[PDB]
Amino acid sequence: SPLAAYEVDDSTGYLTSDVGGPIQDQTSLKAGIRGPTLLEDFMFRQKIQHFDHERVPERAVHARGAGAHGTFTSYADWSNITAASFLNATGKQTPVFVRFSTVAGSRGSADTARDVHGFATRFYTDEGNFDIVGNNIPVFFIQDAIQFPDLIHSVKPRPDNEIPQAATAHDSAWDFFSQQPSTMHTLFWAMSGHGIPRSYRHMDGFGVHTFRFVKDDGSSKLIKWHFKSRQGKASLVWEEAQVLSGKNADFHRQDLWDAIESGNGPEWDVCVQIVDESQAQAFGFDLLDPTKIIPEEYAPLTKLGLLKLDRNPTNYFAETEQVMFQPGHIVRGIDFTEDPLLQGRLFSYLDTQLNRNGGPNFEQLPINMPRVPIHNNNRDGAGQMFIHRNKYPYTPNTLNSGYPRQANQNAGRGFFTAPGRTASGALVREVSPTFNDHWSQPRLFFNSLTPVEQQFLVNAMRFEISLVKSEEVKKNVLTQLNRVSHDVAVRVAAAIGLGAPDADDTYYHNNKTAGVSIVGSGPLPTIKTLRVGILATTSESSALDQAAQLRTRLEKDGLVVTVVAETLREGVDQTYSTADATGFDGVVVVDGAAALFASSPLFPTGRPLQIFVDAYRWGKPVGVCGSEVLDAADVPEDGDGVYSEESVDMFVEEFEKGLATFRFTDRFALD
Amino acid sequence: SPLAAYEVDDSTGYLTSDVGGPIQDQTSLKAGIRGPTLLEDFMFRQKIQHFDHERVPERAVHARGAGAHGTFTSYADWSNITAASFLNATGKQTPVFVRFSTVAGSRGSADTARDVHGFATRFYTDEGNFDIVGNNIPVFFIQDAIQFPDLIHSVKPRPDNEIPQAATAHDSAWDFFSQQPSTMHTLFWAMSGHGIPRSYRHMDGFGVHTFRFVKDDGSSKLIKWHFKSRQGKASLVWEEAQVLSGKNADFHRQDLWDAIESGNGPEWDVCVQIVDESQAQAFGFDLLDPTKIIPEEYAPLTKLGLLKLDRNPTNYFAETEQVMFQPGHIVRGIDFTEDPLLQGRLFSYLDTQLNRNGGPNFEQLPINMPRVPIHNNNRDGAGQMFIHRNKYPYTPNTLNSGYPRQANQNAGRGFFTAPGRTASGALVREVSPTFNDHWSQPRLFFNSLTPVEQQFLVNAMRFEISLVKSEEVKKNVLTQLNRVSHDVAVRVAAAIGLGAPDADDTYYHNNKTAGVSIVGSGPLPTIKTLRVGILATTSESSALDQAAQLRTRLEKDGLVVTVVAETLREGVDQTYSTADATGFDGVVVVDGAAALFSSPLFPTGRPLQIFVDAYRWGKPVGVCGGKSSEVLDAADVPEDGDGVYSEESVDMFVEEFEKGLATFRFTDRFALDS
Amino acid sequence: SPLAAYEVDDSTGYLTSDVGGPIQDQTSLKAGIRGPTLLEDFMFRQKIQHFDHERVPERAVHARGAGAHGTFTSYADWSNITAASFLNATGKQTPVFVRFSTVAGSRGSADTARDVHGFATRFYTDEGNFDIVGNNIPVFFIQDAIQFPDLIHSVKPRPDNEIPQAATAHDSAWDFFSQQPSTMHTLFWAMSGHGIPRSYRHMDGFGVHTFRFVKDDGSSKLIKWHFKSRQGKASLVWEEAQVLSGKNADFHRQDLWDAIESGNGPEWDVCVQIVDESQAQAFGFDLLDPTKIIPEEYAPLTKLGLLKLDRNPTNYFAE
Ligand code: HDD
Ligand code: HDD
Numbered sequence A: 001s002p003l004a005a006y007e008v009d010d011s012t013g014y015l016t017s018d019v020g021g022p023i024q025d026q027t028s029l030k031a032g033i034r035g036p037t038l039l040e041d042f043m044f045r046q047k048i049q050h051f052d053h054e055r056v057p058e059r060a061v062h063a064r065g066a067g068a069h070g071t072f073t074s075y076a077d078w079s080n081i082t083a084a085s086f087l088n089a090t091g092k093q094t095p096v097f098v099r100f101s102t103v104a105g106s107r108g109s110a111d112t113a114r115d116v117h118g119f120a121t122r123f124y125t126d127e128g129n130f131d132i133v134g135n136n137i138p139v140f141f142i143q144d145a146i147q148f149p150d151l152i153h154s155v156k157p158r159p160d161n162e163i164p165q166a167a168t169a170h171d172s173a174w175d176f177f178s179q180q181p182s183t184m185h186t187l188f189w190a191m192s193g194h195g196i197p198r199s200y201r202h203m204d205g206f207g208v209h210t211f212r213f214v215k216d217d218g219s220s221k222l223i224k225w226h227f228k229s230r231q232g233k234a235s236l237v238w239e240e241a242q243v244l245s246g247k248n249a250d251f252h253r254q255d256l257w258d259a260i261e262s263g264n265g266p267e268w269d270v271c272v273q274i275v276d277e278s279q280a281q282a283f284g285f286d287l288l289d290p291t292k293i294i295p296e297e298y299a300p301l302t303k304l305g306l307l308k309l310d311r312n313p314t315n316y317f318a319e320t321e322q323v324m325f326q327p328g329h330i331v332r333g334i335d336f337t338e339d340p341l342l343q344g345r346l347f348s349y350l351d352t353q354l355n356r357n358g359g360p361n362f363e364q365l366p367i368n369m370p371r372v373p374i375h376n377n378n379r380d381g382a383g384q385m386f387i388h389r390n391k392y393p394y395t396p397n398t399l400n401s402g403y404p405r406q407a408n409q410n411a412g413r414g415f416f417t418a419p420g421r422t423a424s425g426a427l428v429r430e431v432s433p434t435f436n437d438h439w440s441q442p443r444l445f446f447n448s449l450t451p452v453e454q455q456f457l458v459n460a461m462r463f464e465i466s467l468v469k470s471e472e473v474k475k476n477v478l479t480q481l482n483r484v485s486h487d488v489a490v491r492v493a494a495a496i497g498l499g500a501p502d503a504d505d506t507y508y509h510n511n512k513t514a515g516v517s518i519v520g521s522g523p524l525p526t527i528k529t530l531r532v533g534i535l536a537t538t539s540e541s542s543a544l545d546q547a548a549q550l551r552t553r554l555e556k557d558g559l560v561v562t563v564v565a566e567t568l569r570e571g572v573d574q575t576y577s578t579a580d581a582t583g584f585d586g587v588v589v590v591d592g593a594a595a596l597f598a599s600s601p602l603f604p605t606g607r608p609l610q611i612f613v614d615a616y617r618w619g620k621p622v623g624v625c626g627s628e629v630l631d632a633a634d635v636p637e638d639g640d641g642v643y644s645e646e647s648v649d650m651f652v653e654e655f656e657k658g659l660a661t662f663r664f665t666d667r668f669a670l671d
Numbered sequence B: 001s002p003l004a005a006y007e008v009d010d011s012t013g014y015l016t017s018d019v020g021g022p023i024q025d026q027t028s029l030k031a032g033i034r035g036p037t038l039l040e041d042f043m044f045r046q047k048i049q050h051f052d053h054e055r056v057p058e059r060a061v062h063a064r065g066a067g068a069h070g071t072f073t074s075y076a077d078w079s080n081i082t083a084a085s086f087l088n089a090t091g092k093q094t095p096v097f098v099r100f101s102t103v104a105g106s107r108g109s110a111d112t113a114r115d116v117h118g119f120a121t122r123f124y125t126d127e128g129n130f131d132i133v134g135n136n137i138p139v140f141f142i143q144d145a146i147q148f149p150d151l152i153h154s155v156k157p158r159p160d161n162e163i164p165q166a167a168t169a170h171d172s173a174w175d176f177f178s179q180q181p182s183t184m185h186t187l188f189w190a191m192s193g194h195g196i197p198r199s200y201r202h203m204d205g206f207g208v209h210t211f212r213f214v215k216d217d218g219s220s221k222l223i224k225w226h227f228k229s230r231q232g233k234a235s236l237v238w239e240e241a242q243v244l245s246g247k248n249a250d251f252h253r254q255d256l257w258d259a260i261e262s263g264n265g266p267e268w269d270v271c272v273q274i275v276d277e278s279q280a281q282a283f284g285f286d287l288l289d290p291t292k293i294i295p296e297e298y299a300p301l302t303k304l305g306l307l308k309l310d311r312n313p314t315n316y317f318a319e320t321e322q323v324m325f326q327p328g329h330i331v332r333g334i335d336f337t338e339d340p341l342l343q344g345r346l347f348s349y350l351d352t353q354l355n356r357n358g359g360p361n362f363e364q365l366p367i368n369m370p371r372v373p374i375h376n377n378n379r380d381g382a383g384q385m386f387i388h389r390n391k392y393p394y395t396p397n398t399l400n401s402g403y404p405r406q407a408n409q410n411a412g413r414g415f416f417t418a419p420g421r422t423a424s425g426a427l428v429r430e431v432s433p434t435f436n437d438h439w440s441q442p443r444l445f446f447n448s449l450t451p452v453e454q455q456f457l458v459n460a461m462r463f464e465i466s467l468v469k470s471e472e473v474k475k476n477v478l479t480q481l482n483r484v485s486h487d488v489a490v491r492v493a494a495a496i497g498l499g500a501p502d503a504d505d506t507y508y509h510n511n512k513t514a515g516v517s518i519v520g521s522g523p524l525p526t527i528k529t530l531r532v533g534i535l536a537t538t539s540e541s542s543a544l545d546q547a548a549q550l551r552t553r554l555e556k557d558g559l560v561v562t563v564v565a566e567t568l569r570e571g572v573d574q575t576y577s578t579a580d581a582t583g584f585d586g587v588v589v590v591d592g593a594a595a596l597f598s599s600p601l602f603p604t605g606r607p608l609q610i611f612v613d614a615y616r617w618g619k620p621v622g623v624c625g626g627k628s629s630e631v632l633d634a635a636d637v638p639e640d641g642d643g644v645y646s647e648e649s650v651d652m653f654v655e656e657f658e659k660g661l662a663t664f665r666f667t668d669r670f671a672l673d674s
Numbered sequence C: 001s002p003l004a005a006y007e008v009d010d011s012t013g014y015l016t017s018d019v020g021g022p023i024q025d026q027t028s029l030k031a032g033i034r035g036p037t038l039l040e041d042f043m044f045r046q047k048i049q050h051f052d053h054e055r056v057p058e059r060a061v062h063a064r065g066a067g068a069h070g071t072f073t074s075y076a077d078w079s080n081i082t083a084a085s086f087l088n089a090t091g092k093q094t095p096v097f098v099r100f101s102t103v104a105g106s107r108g109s110a111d112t113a114r115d116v117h118g119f120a121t122r123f124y125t126d127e128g129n130f131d132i133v134g135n136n137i138p139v140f141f142i143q144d145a146i147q148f149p150d151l152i153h154s155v156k157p158r159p160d161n162e163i164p165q166a167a168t169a170h171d172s173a174w175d176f177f178s179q180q181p182s183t184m185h186t187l188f189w190a191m192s193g194h195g196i197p198r199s200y201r202h203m204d205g206f207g208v209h210t211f212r213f214v215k216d217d218g219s220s221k222l223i224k225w226h227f228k229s230r231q232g233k234a235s236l237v238w239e240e241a242q243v244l245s246g247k248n249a250d251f252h253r254q255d256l257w258d259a260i261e262s263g264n265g266p267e268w269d270v271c272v273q274i275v276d277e278s279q280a281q282a283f284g285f286d287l288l289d290p291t292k293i294i295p296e297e298y299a300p301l302t303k304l305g306l307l308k309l310d311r312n313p314t315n316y317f318a319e
């Protein structure tokens, strides 16, 4: 609503300065028609001064990302567990804005880098903005906020030459990971398919920390936030992600923009695990430790409500670039815990917005404003957009009749710290011994992945570690991996020409936990928005008709279809020159196009076949509708995810199950 | 109230964060009742971070000032001289905002420093914001904008110790003045009563530069802007200005605030001198030279309209502190000239707002916004408040149908440079020799003051120059003063124990010009708002009765009356302890209070000092009731003196006293050099 | 010293840009001798751009103030009470910088306003800079830092018109004082001659808070800092202070400058009251409470060393 009031419409009218003076902006004022530009040319200077100052500092982490507006809807009256107003009645709706991001890359880096991903959600509640600033991975690399610049320095580019962009595959990152074993758990998630999701819509979100739900009576329970994707979970394969980074650095923000514009806004169930305060140490680790998950076997998910994203921003800079989240944006009914990672974040997010906004009044920007009245004695500051009528902004006062009133547990629905919280003991800079098991849970995670998924994780480590120059770093890395799993360390060492150290079984175990596998999570629940490329030709009229037939049948089921040919015309969306297998979730070749697969100035040598072969190699559903093609491609007609029909309607029925299966993992070799 | 849309009301409600979460802000969150404060206390950090960041850089000059909202009303359709939309119809009304200031002092320096004063006016017109950023003195110290930092560094405090505050009475300033003879004219104005005005309401405003009026057909005329005060002109005397600087640093801002709140908003006639392009060098000087005035005998003032300030800001910081004036905020119908001082100002004011605002979107602050729609392709930048719909912000485009459209002389009422302007010649860093006479106009100015005004100007120079430690600088100063006037140089040299150099008559003359004298402008046209202190006593109930009677009769003529006694009670506004003569424009003692003329309630001799100070500073003083000799004798004031009043009758006392307030100052109480 | 190495001498030489190119700065470049100024005039823009950006925000409190360099010399090896390295040997010298100030006025307000005064001392020790950021009055108005903007909004000028400058003599200040009774102790000090000292050299400095001295073995004691003036204590009277504010707004800064230039640099004995941890509530109040002094009858002063100011800054802004 502050969003609509600040929109500026330029669809009609004459150019004006920022002070409303009609002007021109196409030629400089000069002393004669071939003469020097004049200093008194105010039109030139105001325009270029604005241009000169357009940029602001990128976020220190999560610089690369994209956002959308939507709604959250409560499923029930949750007063039984929290006083939180946005959860206080069935069907209660609250507007949201969400930004998704990577962690390490600068603002112009590729979406499909391997990375932890941000999932930050703002709920504009009727008792204040509430932000959950989370990630797609439920556990974090480090156990104390003070270590965050060490982690980030080590993973960001080496500071002499600023290489490599958006990547952990260099010595410093692996030096840090091997010297700081708290990193293992998040490292294993990021080395799995969770590090390369198929889209922002196909990943989950997690608050990571344990928080508290607090009731109006003051009793509390411990919670973890989980946002569970209704689109299902899906990942790229690494070799595909690399090419995609080059062919389309905007892949995830494009995918989100497109799904929203087509009426397919993504959805999540907002859930919690809820446990009692006495269970803080009951599960075999400390709930204050952000490197641990609570297995679903010990605490099931309760569904609180529905999160839907359904409207794109109007201006990226003003909304997505300027949104300033804070876990300190908290509301009555929620409280913090003593997680030393969370505790330090509270300081950092308030402070960093001064850097980004260059002034203290960043909560006045339309995107950061609340949707309820503000009453407080904050004043002045650069960029002050309010005119305060209260000329006695201090408490206690009589000159403004004692207003604003103090709000607390008793009065004014004030935020209040959970009143059962205590502290005791020496003031110390010590890590709790309860945080010391860094290896059991990564092993639990690894155990819970399918064999193919385990192989992809080993191969991600083989790829990254083989790029580490230092032989000593590589050995130290093997030492740590070996504490999680000997087999992992053996298979990793094989690719780098070192021997693994002997098995150390202190942390080894065979336990599994549900719901962490991507491959294991069954077929996608929906195929809407998935992309089908139809490889066709203009040389045969039958090819284009076959292409058009297929189009209409696939588009009916909500698939985004691209017909590719040598050159554009009616019915053809893309040329072979601009097409690539990274652009599709499945690829169909219409038999009429068989000749392209066996040279043209219109596209690089071998392109049409390369698209089909890359798609197959990357595990995608592929087919021919009309077997010369299958033999050009070395693609066996009996393979799972390979479709060959002369019949259109049988082709499509089968192909669509392939899209749901999404990837055909039998095409990847195991150790 | 023109800015009502941005106001925030806190007359009810619970405290919230800036994101609307209700909170408390009186006690920190601690680990135990006598424990350490916690980092998770976001209530504490949000409030303190806001406080830690409240201040913004002061303006590089004119840092000390005060402002008010108003209205400008046009007296005519001025289409026949200018296309300016705000001047296009009789009675047309445009909101304004004005800020007045000193030049040299920091924030918190005293209003009544001796200085050039700013008088900056924003007209929020229906064709964009138009600013006239003027001073109370019509000529400037320097002839080229590039010399501004030199001037300002020399006047501002010495950079090793930052002494002295808000004063040109130090070596560096007079070193600059004496080495840069262009300074002489403004220097003479600042050493006159114009350097110490009685209030912002009692000074004029001037644009200083020659500008152009431009008609829709492209023809232009040369103009000077004059804002002529309807309250009259009035000054302090130096010795009063110094005491006032201590007793009430906020004298001028309080005076303006009070006049507006009492329904006595000050007024100016906004006027121009208008001359042809052909007259640029016709008056014996260059109209491009900002050190020169056009004598009113050569070009009379034309009244364009009325400026009235009638509404005080709601929040000083948000309005007065954040207002960002620019002579680059120009509208169709006005243009610049090649005055080299003006020319560089165009650059400085756009640049310096980046320092003040800390980001490029300073035109979006409520006080800076225009009152018409904005359509342009400026985007992003820190602090961006707009959400722009047009996703094609480039020209030329087809994807936004070629909008926004280019505005110019022939379409969309665009600004346009006066089309008869030309340049010719080498690209030079040279001063035009037409700028070289630095001395004739300061002499013209000096000749146009009354004998007592001339004395006051000489005495201001004696005061400041006697504080210059360098004997070499004092000598250089006398050299320049001597080129304006031998008599000035001799009279100033007398105080500083140097001989003046031999007369040099190159620039001496005896011409005079109307309208530059303050003493010579006759009685004030109005005495509304002037301050009368009535010195009484609580010892005698009849003194209080007399004070009450006098109050009723003075208030019915719109004077602001303060009754002073030993202690407060009904009928008494101020105690003697807080009272001072700098607080009044006239002083009356009620004869019941004669005995006061020791107590633990006020400093010794305070009641008499107020009366003696007021008399010595030239103010109307008197005793009401009939018994006047004890007070006048104690004070050493002659009963028959001009501006000295004694009557038994309250009615007759007030009639006479009110003539004295309009006379304002009694100049026969000041000695003149022979 | 970082200061000496960053000094810039301009007693000879030709004018240069900030990147070392010789230039002139007295006339703008124009198209013709009576023509418009050219955008290509980089000499003009670099000079004006610097001028346009010379100011920085004043301090949110204590904006009006003045400073000097000097030395601190320890009287003893204080290892028996603190591990602090600048106090570890008789005669050990540490460079200092001190800035004195008022609290409420903006940076061009008068020195002789009635107010609490700042006395902030930096010791550039051989184990890091150590700052004691104190006032000339030993107790503070409020008991919790979260109330500081309330105190400060109330004493600073009313926000609609920004009146009155540098004074507590207005409704909002007295409203706060009368609603928030913790203010009474400092109020009494500020209303006494401690609010209008004769000079920065004629006042004491106090750390105000209780701090701790920690020995290398880890034991600790509670301390209050006191800087006791060797010039004696002296104050103005109010009628005089008011006139002085107008006649010389720079009175204290001039006084300090002159005393140093004449070889009369001011001195303070740096002292502590030192008490056991067990005595935090022994004296009839809580030593965590910054509105309370420890009467010297209950804990005497120990003199640690001599603070002397003896060198004025070279550039006021930079230092
Ligand atoms: C103490 C330092 C620190 C620590 C330990 C963390 N962060 Fe953080 N985070 C920041 C300091 C920070 C920051 C420097 O303050 C950022 C950069 C820009 C911003 O607004 O805050 C930020 C940005 C940021 C963003 C992007 C928000 C947006 O899209 O604008 C997300 C999603 C996260 N963080 C999430 C996390 C999670 C899930 C963490 C561990 C559980 C975490 N951060 C630990
Ligand atoms: C080239 C530099 C330069 C030159 C030659 C001038 N000025 Fe200026 N002026 C500034 C640079 C500047 C500035 C640094 O840009 C200021 C300080 C803050 C601001 O907004 O602009 C300013 C402020 C300022 C103000 C205060 C506006 C306000 O209340 O906010 C007034 C009244 C003037 N000036 C008036 C003048 C007059 C009448 C001049 C000679 C005719 C003059 N200036 C020459």
Ligand code: HDD
Pocket (backbone or CB within 6 Å): B048, B052, C059, C060, C061, C062, C065, C099, C100, C101, C117, C118, C119, C120, C133, C134, C135, C140, C144, C145, C146, C148, C207, C208, C209, C290
């Ligand atoms: C929570 C806010 C807060 C509180 C409770 C205090 N101050 Fe403070 N003080 C500031 C916040 C502040 C500040 C806003 O952070 C300043 C302004 C500029 C700066 O460097 O710090 C400051 C400046 C400042 C200066 C000027 C230092 C200099 O000359 O540059 C002195 C002497 C003091 N303070 C002394 C005190 C004393 C003796 C206090 C009570 C025992 C005190 N302050 C409480």
Ligand SMILES: [Ca+2]
Pocket (backbone or CB within 6 Å): A158, A170, A171, A172, A173
């Ligand atoms: Ca490296």
Ligand SMILES: [Ca+2]
Pocket (backbone or CB within 6 Å): A358, B358
């Ligand atoms: Ca900045």
Ligand SMILES: [Ca+2]
Pocket (backbone or CB within 6 Å): B158, B170, B171, B172, B173
């Ligand atoms: Ca000097």
Ligand SMILES: [Ca+2]
Pocket (backbone or CB within 6 Å): C158, C170, C171, C172, C173
């Ligand atoms: Ca007040």
